[PDB]
Amino acid sequence: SEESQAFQRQLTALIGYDVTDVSNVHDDELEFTRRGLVTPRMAEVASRDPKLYAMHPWVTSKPLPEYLWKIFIVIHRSTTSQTIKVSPDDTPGAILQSFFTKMEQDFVLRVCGRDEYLVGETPIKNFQWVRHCLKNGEEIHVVLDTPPDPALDEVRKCDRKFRVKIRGIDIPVLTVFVEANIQHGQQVLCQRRTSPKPFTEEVLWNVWLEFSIKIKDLPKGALLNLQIYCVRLLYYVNLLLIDHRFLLRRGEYVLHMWQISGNADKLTSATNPDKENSMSISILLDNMPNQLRKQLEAIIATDPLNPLTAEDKELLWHFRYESLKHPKAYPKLFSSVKWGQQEIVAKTYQLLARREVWDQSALDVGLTMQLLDCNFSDENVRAIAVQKLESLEDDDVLHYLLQLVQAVKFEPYHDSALARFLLKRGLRNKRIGHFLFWFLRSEIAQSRHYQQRFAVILEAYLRGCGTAMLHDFTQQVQVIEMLQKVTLDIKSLSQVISQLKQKLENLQNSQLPESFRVPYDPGLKAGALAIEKCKVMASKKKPLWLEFKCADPTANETIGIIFKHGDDLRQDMLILQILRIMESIWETESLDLCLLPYGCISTGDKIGMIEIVKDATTIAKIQQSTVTGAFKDEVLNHWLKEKSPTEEKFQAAVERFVYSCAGYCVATFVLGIGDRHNDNIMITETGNLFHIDFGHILGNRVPFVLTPDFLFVMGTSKTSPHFQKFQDICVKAYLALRHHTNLLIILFSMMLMTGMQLTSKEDIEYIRDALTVGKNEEDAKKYFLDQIEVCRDKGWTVQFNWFLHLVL
Numbered sequence: 001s002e003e004s005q006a007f008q009r010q011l012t013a014l015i016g017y018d019v020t021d022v023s024n025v026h027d028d029e030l031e032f033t034r035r036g037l038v039t040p041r042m043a044e045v046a047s048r049d050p051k052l053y054a055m056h057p058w059v060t061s062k063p064l065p066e067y068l069w070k071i072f073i074v075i076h077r078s079t080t081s082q083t084i085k086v087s088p089d090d091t092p093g094a095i096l097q098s099f100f101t102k103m104e105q106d107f108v109l110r111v112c113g114r115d116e117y118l119v120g121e122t123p124i125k126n127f128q129w130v131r132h133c134l135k136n137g138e139e140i141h142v143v144l145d146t147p148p149d150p151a152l153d154e155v156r157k158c159d160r161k162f163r164v165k166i167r168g169i170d171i172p173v174l175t176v177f178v179e180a181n182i183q184h185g186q187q188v189l190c191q192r193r194t195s196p197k198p199f200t201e202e203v204l205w206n207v208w209l210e211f212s213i214k215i216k217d218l219p220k221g222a223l224l225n226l227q228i229y230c231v232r233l234l235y236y237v238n239l240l241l242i243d244h245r246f247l248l249r250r251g252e253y254v255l256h257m258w259q260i261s262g263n264a265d266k267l268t269s270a271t272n273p274d275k276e277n278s279m280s281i282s283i284l285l286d287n288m289p290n291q292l293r294k295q296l297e298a299i300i301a302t303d304p305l306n307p308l309t310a311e312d313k314e315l316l317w318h319f320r321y322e323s324l325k326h327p328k329a330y331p332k333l334f335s336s337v338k339w340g341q342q343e344i345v346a347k348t349y350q351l352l353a354r355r356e357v358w359d360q361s362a363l364d365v366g367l368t369m370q371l372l373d374c375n376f377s378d379e380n381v382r383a384i385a386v387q388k389l390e391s392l393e394d395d396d397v398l399h400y401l402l403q404l405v406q407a408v409k410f411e412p413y414h415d416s417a418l419a420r421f422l423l424k425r426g427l428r429n430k431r432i433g434h435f436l437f438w439f440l441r442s443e444i445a446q447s448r449h450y451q452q453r454f455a456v457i458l459e460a461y462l463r464g465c466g467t468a469m470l471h472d473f474t475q476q477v478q479v480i481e482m483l484q485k486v487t488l489d490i491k492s493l494s495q496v497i498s499q500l501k502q503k504l505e506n507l508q509n510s511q512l513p514e515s516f517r518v519p520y521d522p523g524l525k526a527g528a529l530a531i532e533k534c535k536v537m538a539s540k541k542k543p544l545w546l547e548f549k550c551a552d553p554t555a556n557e558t559i560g561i562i563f564k565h566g567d568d569l570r571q572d573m574l575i576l577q578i579l580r581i582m583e584s585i586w587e588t589e590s591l592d593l594c595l596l597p598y599g600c601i602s603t604g605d606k607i608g609m610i611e612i613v614k615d616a617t618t619i620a621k622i623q624q625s626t627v628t629g630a631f632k633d634e635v636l637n638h639w640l641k642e643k644s645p646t647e648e649k650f651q652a653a654v655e656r657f658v659y660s661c662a663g664y665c666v667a668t669f670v671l672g673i674g675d676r677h678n679d680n681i682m683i684t685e686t687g688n689l690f691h692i693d694f695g696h697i698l699g700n701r702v703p704f705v706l707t708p709d710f711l712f713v714m715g716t717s718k719t720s721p722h723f724q725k726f727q728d729i730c731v732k733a734y735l736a737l738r739h740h741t742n743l744l745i746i747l748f749s750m751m752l753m754t755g756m757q758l759t760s761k762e763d764i765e766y767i768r769d770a771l772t773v774g775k776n777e778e779d780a781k782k783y784f785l786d787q788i789e790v791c792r793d794k795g796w797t798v799q800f801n802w803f804l805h806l807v808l
């Protein structure tokens with residue numbers, strides 16, 4: 001079809017990858033998956049309420065934080081600005097029908113400046129926007145607008161032993177051999193290796209590697225891992241021994257292998273796209289006492305990063321029907337399985353059929369995600385985790401969306417429950433789909449390993465999001481592509497800003513769309529760009545500082561965005577999303593630590609965009625604008641007095657500081673990134689503190705930053721009242737997180753496995769020490785205070801050293 005061609009062409013443009021490409025494939029799993037997903041896509045399209053899907057009301061079911069539990073709304077019909085008081089449990093329609101008396105009722109209550117609507121049968125106390133404005137004590141300004149026409153959300157019409165024959169490897173450019181492994185969930189079942197031979201542009205063994213395992217004993221999801229050596233590893237490539245159709249693999253295979261540069265990429269079932277420079281390999285296939293109860297309870301009740309010994313697994317397996325009673329033990333129990341034995345696997349399913357407990361149990365995300373990591377290849381084991389995810393509401397789905405998208409790399413096959421799940425939740429929610437779009441486009445644009453699997457998934461989504469969405473994405477992508485070139489061209493080079501003003505002026509011309517949607521915050525529409533406000537930054541990375549006029553006249557603040565190439569913003573995104581999670585955790589405990597998880601979206605290979613926090617500057621700048629390595633205690637406080645004249649304002653900024661400082665002190669501490677520098681810590685003129693550039697720190701001693709300039713602001717020289725207010729919070733905020741150890745851990749693990757040659761046998765096991773695991777809550781309190789003491793003792797010491805290091 002004429003249009004169908006320009007369609008697939010438009011898709012590819014948005015995707016950043018051509019899915020109809022078939023040059024880098026040895027089978028049809030991808031094409032098979034493209035077609036498989038057609039059902040979930042359309043099945044979801046025809047289920048979503050056109051109205052609710054078009055307005056995407058952002059709501060929640062969770063209770064209201066006590067601190068907030070302790071109101072009126074403004075309206076803006078043109079010149080008319082009627083101000084009305086409403087009961088908390090009033091439907092937006094009831095409030096609307098209430099405005100009908102105090103004055104074709106086919107209108108809707110939108111938000112001033114943003115694309116956020118207040119619709120549906122939901123008490124206004126359940127709209128995240130209202131809740132947000134309360135944690136700020138701001139007036140809820142609503143513009144009486146018309147409902148958006150949903151007509152724009154329409155879519156386009158054998159008992160023998162296993163053996164493989166290694167024909168040989170082909171090198172593009174002394175001694176070498178091939179290791180043929182049989183993995184399942186990162187656990188090797190059998191291993192064979194060829195003889196060593198001197199290097200040549202074509203080493204031919206032509207040998208039959210016989211394995212001790214039998215064909216029937218092969219579990220679906222088992223990978224055939226091929227590795228080349230010299231001892232050191234060089235190239236690696238994988239192959240599902242059982243294809244998407246449950247068929248045992250057969251025939252000739254020539255695989256182009258990925259290279260090592262010494263991790264999730266190690267698992268990918270994809271092959272190296274670049275055939276020119278990739279090493280290749282050709283292969284041929286052609287085929288209950290009290291004690292032992294008390295003894296395993298310790299096993300069940302232990303961190304996910306605690307390895308199971310031989311006896312652990314046996315004990316755990318023998319009493320499997322008793323272990324299946326504790327949901328917090330499933331990961332452990334399914335790790336105790338002999339997947340390389342059909343008889344054993346068959347039993348585990350008999351076991352899974354008896355999920356009386358796991359099904360009815362309250363959703364534990366930390367527990368759920370664990371069955372989705374690299375440790376599980378059994379589609380059935382992984383599928384029971386996705387079932388629990390069906391319970392999540394959008395609000396929560398949005399919290400773990402990033403971590404879930406990454407967990408797709410741990411899937412054996414392209415089409416999967418996890419994959420289909422994201423596609424379903426993204427198609428029901430414009431806001432979830434939006435981020436799904438960029439989260440996927442990010443991986444596709446810097447991960448040769450998983451760009452194929454991901455691209456297929458994104459395409460399945462673009463075909464369902466509707467026409468409206470496609471247009472927004474189109475104008476978003478177009479704009480983003482332009483800004484990225486400018487970012488690069490300028491990084492290659494005051495003659496600089498004169499060059500920026502020049503180039504930027506051309507983009508402004510006519511090529512760019514009038515107004516585009518801010519990727520890290522789709523609620524916002526950025527219109528006309530303010531060239532006179534744009535400037536290049538003074539970092540060696542030389543990022544761009546850009547600002548746009550708010551495309552909505554009923555707002556006129558400028559939208560500040562930063563475009564930067566150099567660092568990997570994927571690491572930043574992960575960290576920031578963890579902070580947002582911590583806040584929710586604290587929110588359940590009526591805790592607000594004023595964390596500032598600014599917007600950040602990776603757009604490609606070590607390049608992306610970052611949100612600008614208004615009236616915020618670097619702590620380092622303050623010390624050097626007043627005083628370079630020299631550090632005075634009064635400087636910080638003086639800066640506040642100045643930036644906040646009204647005593648009422650100043651006194652509140654200090655209250656906002658103590659909390660924000662406590663929040664970041666604890667948050668960074670747990671994530672093991674508290675040891676930073678002044679230049680990497682910022683603060684709002686309103687006293688709100690926050691760290692930045694996380695891609696820099698983890699990408700390359702003091703528990704956290706608690707320097708005497710901070711303490712001075714609290715009133716410490718001398719334990720001030722505020723300082724006690726500080727450490728009191730820290731403890732409360734610290735013990736809170738601990739009640740989610742498992743979650744923080746698995747997130748921490750999936751953050752490095754898919755986000756960072758970071759040792760998992762060491763670094764990964766840092767958070768264990770930090771969260772005082774295996775220690776009573778009371779003991780934990782003392783530890784954190786001890787960590788604070790470390791800061792009191794070092795004072796400026798650490799900072800001065802960072803000043804040295806980052807100068808010499």
Ligand SMILES: Oc1cccc(-c2cc(Nc3cccnc3)nc(N3CCOCC3)n2)c1
Nearest residue numbers: 572598610611612613616618692693694695
């Ligand atoms: O996550 C990353 C990664 C790399 C760089 C950053 C990064 C660096 C930076 N530097 C800066 C700004 C102003 C003055 N001096 C230095 N500012 C911000 N912002 C985000 C928060 O709002 C303020 C601007 N982010 C953040």
